[PDB]
Design an enzyme around this catalytic site. Structure first.
Site, PDB file in Angstrom:
ATOM      1  N   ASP A  10       0.705  -1.115  -0.023  1.00  0.00           N
ATOM      2  CA  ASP A  10      -0.008  -0.091  -0.084  1.00  0.00           C
ATOM      3  C   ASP A  10       1.038   1.504  -0.084  1.00  0.00           C
ATOM      4  O   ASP A  10       0.711   2.322   0.856  1.00  0.00           O
ATOM      5  CB  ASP A  10      -0.919   0.033   1.414  1.00  0.00           C
ATOM      6  CG  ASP A  10      -2.058   0.915   0.940  1.00  0.00           C
ATOM      7  OD1 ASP A  10      -2.113   1.450  -0.068  1.00  0.00           O
ATOM      8  OD2 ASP A  10      -2.847   1.152   1.998  1.00  0.00           O
ATOM      9  N   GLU A  40       2.250  -2.616  -5.183  1.00  0.00           N
ATOM     10  CA  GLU A  40       2.153  -0.879  -4.921  1.00  0.00           C
ATOM     11  C   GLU A  40       3.261  -0.444  -4.224  1.00  0.00           C
ATOM     12  O   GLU A  40       3.502   0.353  -3.112  1.00  0.00           O
ATOM     13  CB  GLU A  40       0.940  -0.813  -3.739  1.00  0.00           C
ATOM     14  CG  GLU A  40      -0.385  -1.024  -4.406  1.00  0.00           C
ATOM     15  CD  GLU A  40      -1.678  -0.761  -3.804  1.00  0.00           C
ATOM     16  OE1 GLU A  40      -1.388   0.270  -3.199  1.00  0.00           O
ATOM     17  OE2 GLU A  40      -2.631  -1.189  -3.736  1.00  0.00           O
ATOM     18  N   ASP A 150      -1.088 -10.028  -5.765  1.00  0.00           N
ATOM     19  CA  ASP A 150      -2.306  -9.288  -5.337  1.00  0.00           C
ATOM     20  C   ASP A 150      -3.049  -9.447  -6.546  1.00  0.00           C
ATOM     21  O   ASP A 150      -2.968  -8.608  -7.559  1.00  0.00           O
ATOM     22  CB  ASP A 150      -2.212  -7.760  -5.173  1.00  0.00           C
ATOM     23  CG  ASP A 150      -3.740  -7.338  -4.715  1.00  0.00           C
ATOM     24  OD1 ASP A 150      -4.665  -8.088  -4.355  1.00  0.00           O
ATOM     25  OD2 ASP A 150      -3.493  -6.107  -4.490  1.00  0.00           O
TER      26      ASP A 150
HETATM   27 MG   LIG Z   1      -4.294  -1.266  -2.665  1.00  0.00          MG
END
Ligand SMILES: [Mg+2]
Ligand SMILES: [Mg+2]
Lengths: 248, 254
Positions: A10, A40, A150
């Site tokens: 993130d 990310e 992901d």
């Molecule tokens: Mg995200």
DNA sequence: CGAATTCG
DNA sequence: CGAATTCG
């Protein structure tokens, strides 16, 4: 016996990012996996990793915006090549990052991606999944193929995709679908996004292709479950710590 | 007239009663259209109580059956003298968030029994799932009607073509009037932000939101024509509605 | 996430 | 409308 962590960390969240990045690496230090798949990552995050994880070879999916990375433990993992396959119709700069490596005698094609996010981009996420599954099939049979990333997948989407092919396995399914590490994105347990409602998803998944019983998942655990000094977690995602044996 | 006694004619029209601006003038525009073609039946959506008053003034030769009494709702208008009102039926949409429902009016007209149906299915792409469920409720109701009765649905379905497919397509004995007439281009789109300015949407999107479904014993209900209405700007420089209306004529055959 | 809100 | 955004 080989180990990796896959983790969407993130980087797109700028709040407490320096502390959270350090939190991520404290987690990595605890487990010392052979390989780390990250999603990310942003440039200054990547720059930090290049110093902080200088003991890993770092392969990146892009230079700007946010992108994936694959970290390879020096001395454990021999980096042979990287390949990036585009997602031609991505709206979120997503792609497929592959590295050819070996761990001693065993050749691996290690893959990661951050598939198209959000419910409304299902059809492109599925096309991206197809690209990923297609690529997993291309490696020589003796090459052990591991995707960890992901996926943003919903179960129904995998079904729409035709299901995993017979020679491709989900490590979580292989281990008997354990409950303790099922959801990797959990707004009840994770407060980083400040989302009031409780949503739980198994977005982060591990697929593998190997010659009969040559790759055997041994363990799968959530990581990054402890709040940092700022009262938030390293990421809105949990990471997945996976250990597997190579059995010839 | 005797020759046309075999033909049923109607207009279905979302008249955008939720837009209060120029509403009385726009109501007059809709009523001028009704006076022009003198349809047997008018299916309306987004009627509001003041709009009912306008209709009673400027479309006085129609009996008004409404889908609710407050907020906004559908109506079915029946040409007095031509149409015999037999009963009103309302089916709820339990999961609507927009007070939508299914309004059925049973009538006789031209010596034939009709179940006339309209609805304003859940609006916007976002409420697709609920819209599909409402479509299923509509289709199920059309099929539930006695085989002697002629079933016509006409309303604002808010449908995307792929949603009908996802629904399973129209059942065998149910036909879309536009499709039946061979998908003519001139009345394909009933909501068109390029040609219609009422919403002041600075983009060009068009849809066949407004549709006519009918069920009949084979050959007994034959669509004759389908045309758009409401494409003239009024004095205020706006259209009667953000939707075009549909004018349809059908023959009831032995 | 996903409902709500503006933006064109 | 549909895309981009917000925010709990
Ligand atoms: Mg995200
Ligand atoms: Mg409307």
């Amino acid at each position: 016996t080989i180990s990796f962590i896959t983790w969407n960390i993130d980087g797109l969240d700028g709040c407490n990012l320096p502390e959270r990045a350090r939190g991520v690496c404290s987690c990595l230090a605890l487990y010392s996996p052979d390989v780390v798949f990250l999603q990310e990552v942003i440039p200054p995050y990547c720059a930090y990793l290049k110093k902080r994880a200088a003991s890993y070879t770092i392969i990146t999916g892009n230079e700007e915006g946010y992108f994936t990375a694959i970290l390879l433990k020096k001395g454990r993992v021999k980096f042979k090549s990287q390949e990036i396959i585009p997602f031609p119709n991505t709206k979120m700069m997503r792609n497929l990052l592959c590295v050819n490596v070996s761990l001693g005698g065993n050749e691996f094609c290690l893959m990661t991606s951050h598939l198209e996010s959000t419910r409304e981009h299902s059809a492109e996420r599925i096309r991206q999944l197809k690209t990923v599954l297609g690529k997993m099939q291309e490696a020589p049979d003796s090459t052990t193929v591991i995707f960890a990333g992901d996926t943003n997948l919903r179960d129904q989407e995998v079904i729409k995709c035709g299901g995993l092919p017979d020679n491709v396995f989900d490590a979580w399914e292989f281990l008997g679908k354990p409950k303790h590490c099922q959801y990797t994105w959990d707004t009840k347990a994770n407060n980083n996004l400040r989302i009031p409602a409780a949503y739980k998803h198994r977005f982060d998944r591990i697929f593998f292709r190997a010659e009969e019983g040559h790759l055997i998942p041994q363990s799968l655990d959530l990581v990054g479950l402890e709040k940092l000094d700022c009262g938030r977690f390293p990421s809105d995602h949990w990471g997945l710590l996976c250990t597997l044996n190579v059995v010839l």
